[PDB]
Amino acid sequence: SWEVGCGAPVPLVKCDENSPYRTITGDCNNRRSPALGAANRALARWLPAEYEDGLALPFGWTQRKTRNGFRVPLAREVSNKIVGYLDEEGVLDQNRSLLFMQWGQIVDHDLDFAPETELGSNEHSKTQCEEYCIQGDNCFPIMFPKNDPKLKTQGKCMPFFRAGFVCPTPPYQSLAREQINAVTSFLDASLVYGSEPSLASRLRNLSSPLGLMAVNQEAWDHGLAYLPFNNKKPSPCEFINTTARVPCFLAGDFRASEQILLATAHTLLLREHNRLARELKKLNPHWNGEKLYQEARKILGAFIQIITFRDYLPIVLGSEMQKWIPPYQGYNNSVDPRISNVFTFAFRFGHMEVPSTVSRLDENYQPWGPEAELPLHTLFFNTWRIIKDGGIDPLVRGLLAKKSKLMNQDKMVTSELRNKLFQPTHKIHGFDLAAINLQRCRDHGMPGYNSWRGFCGLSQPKTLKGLQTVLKNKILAKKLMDLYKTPDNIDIWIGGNAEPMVERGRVGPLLACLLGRQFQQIRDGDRFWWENPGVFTEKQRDSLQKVSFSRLICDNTHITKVPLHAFQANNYPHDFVDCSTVDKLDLSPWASREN
Ligand code: HEM
Ligand SMILES: *[C@@H]1O[C@H](CO)[C@@H](O[C@@H]2O[C@H](CO)[C@@H](O)[C@H](O)[C@H]2NC(C)=O)[C@H](O)[C@H]1NC(C)=O
Ligand SMILES: *[C@@H]1O[C@H](CO)[C@@H](O)[C@H](O)[C@H]1NC(C)=O
Ligand SMILES: *[C@@H]1O[C@H](CO)[C@@H](O)[C@H](O)[C@H]1NC(C)=O
Ligand SMILES: *[C@@H]1O[C@H](CO)[C@@H](O)[C@H](O)[C@H]1NC(C)=O
Ligand SMILES: [Ca+2]
């Protein structure tokens, strides 16, 4: 027997089936199996889960219990000995702009979100976890090793709560624990519109019938829109500067304000929806509000797909791209489009691409004022620097003109994220994203590094010398052996990211495999993929292949000079051209005559 029975919180709807538009939840994409790839279902498992008790407890929960005969090393200790470095000189990617990093986070937020178990506020378990580092139920603390400076300064532990899971969330249920994906698995701009009907409707402007999204009423960026403010107090974005009291932004995805460049990207997309809707009204004065919203929505979703598959993936995957993602042959209704649990850790390669500072540049692409360059840690949940300190254009220019960090085996994750991460629930700039990622691998029941190497048809090193050869690094292999004892025990997040990069790419072979298969599936298993015959007309498709990120900047900012290939490293002024040189999106193929 399978167990396709269980499935409790879900939002079930009736499928229209002749609708030319996606649902908000992702239901009804697959006609035979309507819940496939919908939000608020379990992440898929390409391999069976690996928990300490076979069902739900993570490896490292019970100290007595080993993994393959060895204790698993503390997440924070792996972080200290392997992931950290001091010297930011020499660490930048010479042929990837900052936007390369930032597009990755957008795509990843469209595809997956496994929220923490909540149980609501008004609980003393949030105190008990934070205050006393007491493991149990959903509290699974990251303990500091001996000689950690955070011991002196912070406490015994970083609090950490286990991820939510399907059926029930309070008393559990049986078998193997399966984490939830709270967004739609399809690349569909769910991060802009929401993955739930409640939220999607709240994001819309339903006073006017122009199919527009709601915009801020308290603040303008030289007459351009800002996202609306989120309702909710306590607001993490006002906590970081109680004098400015600028709240977080409200968007289709809950993490939109996590850092300032993510909020910036979200603002561009909202702007583009409104631009598109008002252009479509011009051409089709008879279209109602709904039709404008959906039709703009459909274009925007196609834009994300195109940028992602044409410009971004080839420069992640490099020479592996063709091997995993062959040319499109049409919609395949037998393909599983769901995001897999392991993908949500594979795609965290981006954490190693984040540099330590962010810049604001002026109209000649020069430092914008005296405090132009800011440490990244001051910009988590920071909206006041947008509203009170220049709007988005200076941040957008920095995206274009500055570089991503290069993954480096000796310099993996900046300290801005490794020691000074801010979490919305808590009050300190003191968390470790690397340690959280490792702890989360265990929370989610990840098989180890060698299981995934075998999955991908790659060799499985068993010795120090085997690991040296795969990593092509003696010192890194040895530090890994001293902590983990067997390469079978190496957590997937760090194992995958430790491999040298493939030719023309920015991930290694294991990751290229994991990423590559996932992206093949969400393309092939999507009935509304933009090239799937009948989704758009030939002439609409012809118009859509001219989109570029550069054009999106030009249309939705006051920036006049942009590069043509925004993801590669570009110098000002030589690589910068005037916006009037950049191909526009021609919307005349959306004109709808009567007679
Ligand atoms: C300054 C930039 C960024 C910050 C501050 C940030 C922060 C975070 C945080 C706090 C989490 C939750 C971790 C957990 O509890 O397990 C997370 C998850 C994630 N991050 Fe990032 N990150 C950033 C950039 C990126 C980039 C560039 C990518 C990809 C290219 C990325 C991909 C992801 C993914 C896939 C997850 C898992 C989401 C899920 O399914 O729940 N991140 N990140
Ligand atoms: C919903 O859309 C309407 C119509 O576009 C917005 O109202 C206009 O917005 C500008 C800026 O606030 C004003 O100068 C006009 O007074 C408004 N025009 C009309 C015809 O009402 C409205 O702000 C939108 N609402 C939200 C929350 O975004
Ligand atoms: C930068 O990357 C682009 C796009 O992947 C590539 O074609 C170009 O040759 C690269 N530049 C350098 C200097 O290697
Ligand atoms: C708080 O914001 C105000 C402007 O609202 C600014 O002048 C001040 O620097 C900010 N303080 C901090 C500590 O970020
Ligand atoms: C569609 O996908 C299935 C399962 O992944 C695969 O075996 C088959 O080759 C594909 N079928 C078609 C008709 O392309
Ligand atoms: Ca989605």
Tab-separated table of C-alpha atoms in Angstrom, residues 82-456:
chain	number	residue	atom	x	y	z
A	82	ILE	CA	35.037	24.988	7.680
A	83	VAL	CA	32.616	27.664	6.641
A	84	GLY	CA	34.196	30.766	8.151
A	85	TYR	CA	36.863	33.215	7.059
A	86	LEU	CA	38.102	36.719	7.959
A	87	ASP	CA	39.621	38.226	4.847
A	88	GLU	CA	37.083	39.712	2.337
A	89	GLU	CA	39.855	40.770	-0.118
A	90	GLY	CA	39.901	38.692	-3.322
A	91	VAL	CA	36.557	37.015	-2.763
A	92	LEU	CA	34.417	38.685	-5.506
A	93	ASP	CA	33.176	36.960	-8.681
A	94	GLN	CA	34.933	38.660	-11.652
A	95	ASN	CA	32.216	37.646	-14.124
A	96	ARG	CA	28.901	37.757	-12.164
A	97	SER	CA	27.075	40.929	-11.155
A	98	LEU	CA	25.306	41.258	-7.775
A	99	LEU	CA	22.044	40.634	-9.631
A	100	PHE	CA	23.214	37.068	-10.273
A	101	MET	CA	22.983	36.429	-6.551
A	102	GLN	CA	19.724	38.339	-6.214
A	103	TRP	CA	17.849	36.562	-9.050
A	104	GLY	CA	18.636	33.262	-7.395
A	105	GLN	CA	16.899	34.271	-4.187
A	106	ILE	CA	13.837	35.431	-6.182
A	107	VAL	CA	13.559	32.180	-8.068
A	108	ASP	CA	14.053	30.160	-4.896
A	109	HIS	CA	11.306	32.102	-3.154
A	110	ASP	CA	8.895	31.462	-6.010
A	111	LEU	CA	9.464	27.742	-5.656
A	112	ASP	CA	9.834	26.758	-1.991
A	113	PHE	CA	9.063	27.757	1.540
A	114	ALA	CA	9.047	25.404	4.496
A	115	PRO	CA	7.897	27.589	7.445
A	116	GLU	CA	8.765	27.003	11.089
A	117	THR	CA	6.217	25.388	13.337
A	118	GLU	CA	4.455	28.122	15.089
A	119	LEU	CA	1.635	27.092	17.428
A	120	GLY	CA	1.007	30.865	17.596
A	121	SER	CA	2.275	33.608	19.877
A	122	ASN	CA	1.579	33.870	23.692
A	123	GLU	CA	3.768	30.818	24.323
A	124	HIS	CA	6.524	30.214	26.854
A	125	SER	CA	8.098	27.524	24.661
A	126	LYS	CA	9.598	30.478	22.633
A	127	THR	CA	11.100	31.625	25.918
A	128	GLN	CA	11.967	28.069	27.096
A	129	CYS	CA	13.863	27.429	23.772
A	130	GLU	CA	15.599	30.822	23.713
A	131	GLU	CA	16.094	31.390	27.392
A	132	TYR	CA	17.171	27.915	28.555
A	133	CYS	CA	18.281	25.963	25.432
A	134	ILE	CA	15.987	23.073	26.450
A	135	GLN	CA	15.586	20.612	23.628
A	136	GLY	CA	12.151	19.081	23.129
A	137	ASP	CA	9.037	19.101	20.971
A	138	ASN	CA	9.793	21.636	18.230
A	139	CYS	CA	12.757	23.272	19.944
A	140	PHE	CA	15.995	21.815	18.500
A	141	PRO	CA	18.703	24.259	19.699
A	142	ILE	CA	22.041	24.904	18.002
A	143	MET	CA	24.523	24.447	20.888
A	144	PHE	CA	27.813	26.361	20.877
A	145	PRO	CA	30.964	24.252	20.941
A	146	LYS	CA	33.789	24.822	23.375
A	147	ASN	CA	35.824	27.962	22.630
A	148	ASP	CA	33.038	29.631	20.628
A	149	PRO	CA	33.221	33.364	21.253
A	150	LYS	CA	29.423	33.486	21.249
A	151	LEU	CA	29.477	31.626	24.502
A	152	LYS	CA	30.991	34.691	26.167
A	153	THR	CA	28.514	37.092	24.694
A	154	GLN	CA	25.218	35.458	23.684
A	155	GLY	CA	24.365	32.394	25.761
A	156	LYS	CA	24.661	28.622	25.389
A	157	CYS	CA	22.771	28.228	22.151
A	158	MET	CA	21.018	29.722	19.248
A	159	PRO	CA	17.344	28.931	19.278
A	160	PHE	CA	15.993	26.952	16.345
A	161	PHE	CA	12.501	25.592	15.711
A	162	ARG	CA	11.680	22.591	13.592
A	163	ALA	CA	9.966	22.997	10.239
A	164	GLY	CA	6.219	22.489	9.856
A	165	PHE	CA	4.906	19.140	8.554
A	166	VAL	CA	1.777	17.716	6.796
A	167	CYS	CA	-1.579	16.360	8.176
A	168	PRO	CA	-1.467	17.947	11.628
A	169	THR	CA	1.136	20.221	13.143
A	170	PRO	CA	0.509	19.948	16.924
A	171	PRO	CA	0.188	16.215	17.815
A	172	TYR	CA	1.864	14.797	14.841
A	173	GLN	CA	0.644	11.684	13.139
A	174	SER	CA	2.526	8.494	12.115
A	175	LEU	CA	4.991	7.094	9.558
A	176	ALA	CA	7.679	9.446	8.244
A	177	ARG	CA	7.616	13.194	8.878
A	178	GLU	CA	7.165	15.190	5.626
A	179	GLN	CA	7.798	18.982	5.605
A	180	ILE	CA	5.338	21.411	3.967
A	181	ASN	CA	5.945	23.605	0.939
A	182	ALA	CA	3.800	26.693	1.509
A	183	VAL	CA	4.234	28.110	-2.031
A	184	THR	CA	3.434	26.855	-5.543
A	185	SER	CA	5.999	24.497	-7.111
A	186	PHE	CA	5.547	26.083	-10.586
A	187	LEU	CA	7.666	29.041	-11.664
A	188	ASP	CA	4.560	31.318	-11.672
A	189	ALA	CA	5.323	34.578	-9.867
A	190	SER	CA	3.658	33.327	-6.692
A	191	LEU	CA	6.139	35.560	-4.863
A	192	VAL	CA	4.396	38.623	-6.280
A	193	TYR	CA	0.689	37.470	-6.228
A	194	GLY	CA	0.640	35.071	-3.279
A	195	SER	CA	-0.021	31.340	-3.002
A	196	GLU	CA	-3.265	31.652	-1.061
A	197	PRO	CA	-6.596	33.230	-2.102
A	198	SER	CA	-6.887	35.361	1.097
A	199	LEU	CA	-3.520	36.935	0.594
A	200	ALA	CA	-3.792	37.306	-3.185
A	201	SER	CA	-7.024	39.273	-2.833
A	202	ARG	CA	-5.568	41.523	-0.139
A	203	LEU	CA	-2.679	42.384	-2.434
A	204	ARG	CA	-4.993	43.602	-5.150
A	205	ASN	CA	-6.492	47.053	-5.714
A	206	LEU	CA	-10.234	46.312	-5.879
A	207	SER	CA	-11.458	49.922	-5.484
A	208	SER	CA	-10.520	50.694	-9.074
A	209	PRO	CA	-11.327	48.086	-11.756
A	210	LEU	CA	-8.009	48.501	-13.602
A	211	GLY	CA	-6.550	45.083	-12.519
A	212	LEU	CA	-3.807	46.797	-10.538
A	213	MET	CA	-1.954	45.709	-7.399
A	214	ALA	CA	-2.279	47.848	-4.248
A	215	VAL	CA	0.518	50.354	-3.669
A	216	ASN	CA	1.774	52.299	-0.641
A	217	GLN	CA	-0.335	55.389	0.214
A	218	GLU	CA	2.154	56.873	2.729
A	219	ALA	CA	5.234	57.140	0.459
A	220	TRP	CA	6.373	57.533	-3.145
A	221	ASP	CA	9.753	57.098	-4.869
A	222	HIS	CA	9.708	60.187	-7.064
A	223	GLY	CA	6.173	59.319	-8.055
A	224	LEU	CA	6.966	55.552	-8.467
A	225	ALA	CA	5.181	52.947	-6.324
A	226	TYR	CA	6.376	51.276	-3.195
A	227	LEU	CA	4.887	48.096	-1.857
A	228	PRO	CA	2.275	48.549	0.790
A	229	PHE	CA	3.233	48.232	4.438
A	230	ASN	CA	2.438	45.180	6.366
A	231	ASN	CA	-0.336	45.525	8.968
A	232	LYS	CA	1.277	43.490	11.689
A	233	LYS	CA	2.841	44.522	15.003
A	234	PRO	CA	5.279	43.551	16.337
A	235	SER	CA	7.101	44.393	13.078
A	236	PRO	CA	10.732	43.277	12.795
A	237	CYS	CA	11.454	46.208	10.454
A	238	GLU	CA	10.446	48.813	13.032
A	239	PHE	CA	12.357	47.031	15.823
A	240	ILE	CA	15.680	47.585	13.970
A	241	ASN	CA	15.275	51.416	14.233
A	242	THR	CA	12.565	52.487	16.689
A	243	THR	CA	13.062	56.135	15.717
A	244	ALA	CA	12.280	55.632	12.029
A	245	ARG	CA	9.386	53.193	12.741
A	246	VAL	CA	9.166	52.048	9.115
A	247	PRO	CA	7.322	48.716	8.876
A	248	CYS	CA	7.994	45.716	6.634
A	249	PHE	CA	6.487	45.547	3.214
A	250	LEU	CA	3.492	43.382	2.342
A	251	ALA	CA	3.994	41.117	-0.667
A	252	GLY	CA	2.975	37.726	-2.094
A	253	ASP	CA	5.806	36.033	-0.225
A	254	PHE	CA	6.437	36.474	3.506
A	255	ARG	CA	10.200	36.862	3.293
A	256	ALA	CA	10.130	39.949	1.037
A	257	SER	CA	11.773	42.248	3.617
A	258	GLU	CA	14.556	39.812	4.738
A	259	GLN	CA	17.140	42.000	3.159
A	260	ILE	CA	17.029	45.268	1.307
A	261	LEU	CA	17.948	44.079	-2.188
A	262	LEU	CA	15.246	41.357	-2.008
A	263	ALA	CA	12.693	44.088	-1.191
A	264	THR	CA	14.083	46.117	-4.038
A	265	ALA	CA	13.596	43.259	-6.510
A	266	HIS	CA	10.033	42.767	-5.212
A	267	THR	CA	9.309	46.470	-5.869
A	268	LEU	CA	10.439	46.274	-9.481
A	269	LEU	CA	8.046	43.357	-10.133
A	270	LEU	CA	5.051	45.046	-8.511
A	271	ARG	CA	5.788	48.108	-10.658
A	272	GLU	CA	5.915	45.964	-13.784
A	273	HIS	CA	2.513	44.435	-13.049
A	274	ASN	CA	0.908	47.886	-12.791
A	275	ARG	CA	2.722	49.095	-15.918
A	276	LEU	CA	1.492	46.101	-17.887
A	277	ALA	CA	-2.075	46.429	-16.618
A	278	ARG	CA	-2.326	50.085	-17.618
A	279	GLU	CA	-0.762	49.374	-21.061
A	280	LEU	CA	-3.302	46.586	-21.565
A	281	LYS	CA	-6.190	48.892	-20.676
A	282	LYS	CA	-4.997	51.309	-23.376
A	283	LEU	CA	-5.201	48.501	-25.960
A	284	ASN	CA	-8.363	46.820	-24.682
A	285	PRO	CA	-10.585	49.534	-23.118
A	286	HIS	CA	-13.439	47.036	-22.741
A	287	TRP	CA	-11.525	44.468	-20.558
A	288	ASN	CA	-12.718	44.329	-16.931
A	289	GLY	CA	-10.472	44.404	-13.746
A	290	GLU	CA	-10.183	40.650	-13.426
A	291	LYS	CA	-9.159	40.203	-17.011
A	292	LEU	CA	-6.512	42.936	-16.672
A	293	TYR	CA	-5.102	41.357	-13.506
A	294	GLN	CA	-4.909	37.826	-14.881
A	295	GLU	CA	-3.548	38.904	-18.194
A	296	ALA	CA	-0.816	41.064	-16.708
A	297	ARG	CA	-0.156	38.227	-14.191
A	298	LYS	CA	0.331	35.756	-17.055
A	299	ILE	CA	2.854	37.991	-18.796
A	300	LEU	CA	4.853	38.545	-15.578
A	301	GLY	CA	5.003	34.760	-14.913
A	302	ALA	CA	6.293	34.207	-18.419
A	303	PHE	CA	8.945	36.892	-17.887
A	304	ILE	CA	10.298	35.064	-14.783
A	305	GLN	CA	10.449	31.762	-16.681
A	306	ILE	CA	12.310	33.305	-19.582
A	307	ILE	CA	14.899	35.231	-17.574
A	308	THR	CA	15.379	32.129	-15.399
A	309	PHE	CA	15.750	29.554	-18.188
A	310	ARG	CA	17.457	31.664	-20.871
A	311	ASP	CA	19.770	33.978	-18.904
A	312	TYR	CA	20.271	32.537	-15.353
A	313	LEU	CA	20.389	28.765	-15.502
A	314	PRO	CA	23.043	28.489	-18.196
A	315	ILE	CA	25.459	30.474	-16.098
A	316	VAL	CA	24.719	28.408	-12.959
A	317	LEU	CA	24.854	25.010	-14.652
A	318	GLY	CA	27.484	25.871	-17.321
A	319	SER	CA	28.551	22.889	-19.354
A	320	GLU	CA	26.182	20.598	-17.393
A	321	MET	CA	23.069	22.547	-18.556
A	322	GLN	CA	22.341	20.393	-21.690
A	323	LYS	CA	22.910	17.091	-19.931
A	324	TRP	CA	20.109	17.889	-17.398
A	325	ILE	CA	17.785	20.265	-19.273
A	326	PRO	CA	17.441	19.232	-22.957
A	327	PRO	CA	15.521	21.441	-25.397
A	328	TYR	CA	11.838	21.718	-24.674
A	329	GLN	CA	9.626	19.097	-26.384
A	330	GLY	CA	6.249	20.015	-24.899
A	331	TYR	CA	4.171	19.446	-21.794
A	332	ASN	CA	4.567	15.976	-20.284
A	333	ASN	CA	1.599	15.126	-17.998
A	334	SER	CA	3.522	12.206	-16.452
A	335	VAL	CA	6.265	14.408	-15.006
A	336	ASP	CA	6.178	15.158	-11.287
A	337	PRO	CA	6.382	18.982	-11.008
A	338	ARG	CA	6.642	19.083	-7.165
A	339	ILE	CA	9.657	20.607	-5.543
A	340	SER	CA	11.719	17.937	-3.746
A	341	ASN	CA	12.879	18.306	-0.154
A	342	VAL	CA	16.593	18.036	-1.219
A	343	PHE	CA	16.245	20.885	-3.783
A	344	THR	CA	15.409	23.281	-0.966
A	345	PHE	CA	18.957	22.636	0.369
A	346	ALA	CA	20.664	22.370	-2.976
A	347	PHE	CA	19.439	25.835	-3.992
A	348	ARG	CA	21.024	27.280	-0.841
A	349	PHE	CA	24.311	27.414	-2.808
A	350	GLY	CA	23.412	31.073	-3.069
A	351	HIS	CA	24.391	31.675	0.550
A	352	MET	CA	28.025	31.427	-0.561
A	353	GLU	CA	27.463	34.089	-3.233
A	354	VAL	CA	26.462	36.851	-0.862
A	355	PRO	CA	29.183	39.518	-0.301
A	356	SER	CA	29.724	41.464	2.882
A	357	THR	CA	28.569	44.934	1.762
A	358	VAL	CA	25.852	46.644	-0.251
A	359	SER	CA	26.317	49.946	-2.137
A	360	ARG	CA	24.157	52.843	-3.149
A	361	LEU	CA	25.400	54.514	-6.325
A	362	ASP	CA	24.384	57.949	-7.752
A	363	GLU	CA	23.441	58.779	-11.362
A	364	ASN	CA	27.037	58.623	-12.581
A	365	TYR	CA	27.369	55.281	-10.764
A	366	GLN	CA	29.456	56.917	-7.974
A	367	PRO	CA	29.264	56.431	-4.245
A	368	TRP	CA	26.030	57.986	-3.096
A	369	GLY	CA	26.948	60.130	-0.154
A	370	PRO	CA	29.311	59.539	2.768
A	371	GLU	CA	27.743	56.214	4.025
A	372	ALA	CA	27.438	54.760	0.519
A	373	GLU	CA	28.704	51.286	1.355
A	374	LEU	CA	26.961	49.516	4.199
A	375	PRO	CA	27.674	46.234	5.933
A	376	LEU	CA	25.124	43.614	4.954
A	377	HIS	CA	24.158	42.851	8.541
A	378	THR	CA	22.656	46.309	9.001
A	379	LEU	CA	20.272	45.606	6.121
A	380	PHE	CA	18.326	42.532	7.249
A	381	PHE	CA	14.622	43.552	7.723
A	382	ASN	CA	15.572	47.127	6.929
A	383	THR	CA	12.974	49.101	4.997
A	384	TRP	CA	13.802	52.588	6.390
A	385	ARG	CA	16.914	52.865	4.239
A	386	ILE	CA	14.659	52.618	1.198
A	387	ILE	CA	11.870	54.990	2.348
A	388	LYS	CA	14.079	57.509	4.238
A	389	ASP	CA	17.387	57.293	2.276
A	390	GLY	CA	17.046	57.618	-1.513
A	391	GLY	CA	14.422	55.096	-2.807
A	392	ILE	CA	15.374	52.102	-4.948
A	393	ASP	CA	17.401	53.479	-7.842
A	394	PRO	CA	20.660	53.808	-5.973
A	395	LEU	CA	20.268	50.188	-4.806
A	396	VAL	CA	19.370	49.040	-8.339
A	397	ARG	CA	22.520	50.649	-9.753
A	398	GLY	CA	24.606	48.760	-7.126
A	399	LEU	CA	22.945	45.540	-8.279
A	400	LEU	CA	24.159	46.200	-11.801
A	401	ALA	CA	27.551	47.602	-11.093
A	402	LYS	CA	28.793	45.501	-8.215
A	403	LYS	CA	29.732	41.853	-8.108
A	404	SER	CA	28.496	38.715	-6.392
A	405	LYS	CA	30.788	36.793	-4.076
A	406	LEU	CA	32.518	33.777	-5.623
A	407	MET	CA	32.143	30.439	-3.833
A	408	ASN	CA	35.579	29.624	-2.567
A	409	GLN	CA	36.595	26.423	-0.723
A	410	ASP	CA	38.649	28.532	1.855
A	411	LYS	CA	36.095	31.381	2.104
A	412	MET	CA	32.630	29.992	2.019
A	413	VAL	CA	30.054	32.218	3.821
A	414	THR	CA	30.650	35.829	4.901
A	415	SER	CA	30.492	36.671	8.624
A	416	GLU	CA	27.715	39.104	7.948
A	417	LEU	CA	25.585	35.947	7.574
A	418	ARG	CA	27.704	33.473	9.635
A	419	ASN	CA	27.735	35.460	12.873
A	420	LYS	CA	25.407	38.442	12.443
A	421	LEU	CA	22.202	37.178	10.918
A	422	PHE	CA	19.012	38.767	12.275
A	423	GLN	CA	15.929	36.535	12.739
A	424	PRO	CA	12.429	38.132	12.810
A	425	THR	CA	11.263	36.402	16.051
A	426	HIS	CA	14.351	37.377	18.074
A	427	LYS	CA	16.189	40.538	18.939
A	428	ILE	CA	19.915	40.119	18.193
A	429	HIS	CA	22.165	40.405	15.141
A	430	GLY	CA	23.740	37.107	16.309
A	431	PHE	CA	22.626	34.073	14.308
A	432	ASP	CA	24.619	31.797	11.955
A	433	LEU	CA	22.986	30.996	8.617
A	434	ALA	CA	25.428	28.156	7.865
A	435	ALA	CA	24.730	26.442	11.168
A	436	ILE	CA	21.014	26.904	10.613
A	437	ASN	CA	21.300	25.324	7.164
A	438	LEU	CA	23.124	22.276	8.601
A	439	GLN	CA	20.725	21.910	11.513
A	440	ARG	CA	17.855	22.186	9.002
A	441	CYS	CA	19.236	19.338	6.809
A	442	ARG	CA	18.921	17.110	9.847
A	443	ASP	CA	15.454	18.512	10.751
A	444	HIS	CA	14.253	17.607	7.239
A	445	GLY	CA	15.610	14.081	7.285
A	446	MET	CA	18.229	14.466	4.643
A	447	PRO	CA	20.193	11.490	3.487
A	448	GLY	CA	23.928	12.093	3.495
A	449	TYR	CA	26.394	13.156	0.885
A	450	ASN	CA	27.173	9.685	-0.487
A	451	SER	CA	23.483	8.776	-0.909
A	452	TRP	CA	23.052	11.792	-3.098
A	453	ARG	CA	26.274	11.127	-5.049
A	454	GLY	CA	24.860	7.635	-5.789
A	455	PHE	CA	21.507	9.113	-6.798
A	456	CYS	CA	23.323	11.249	-9.381
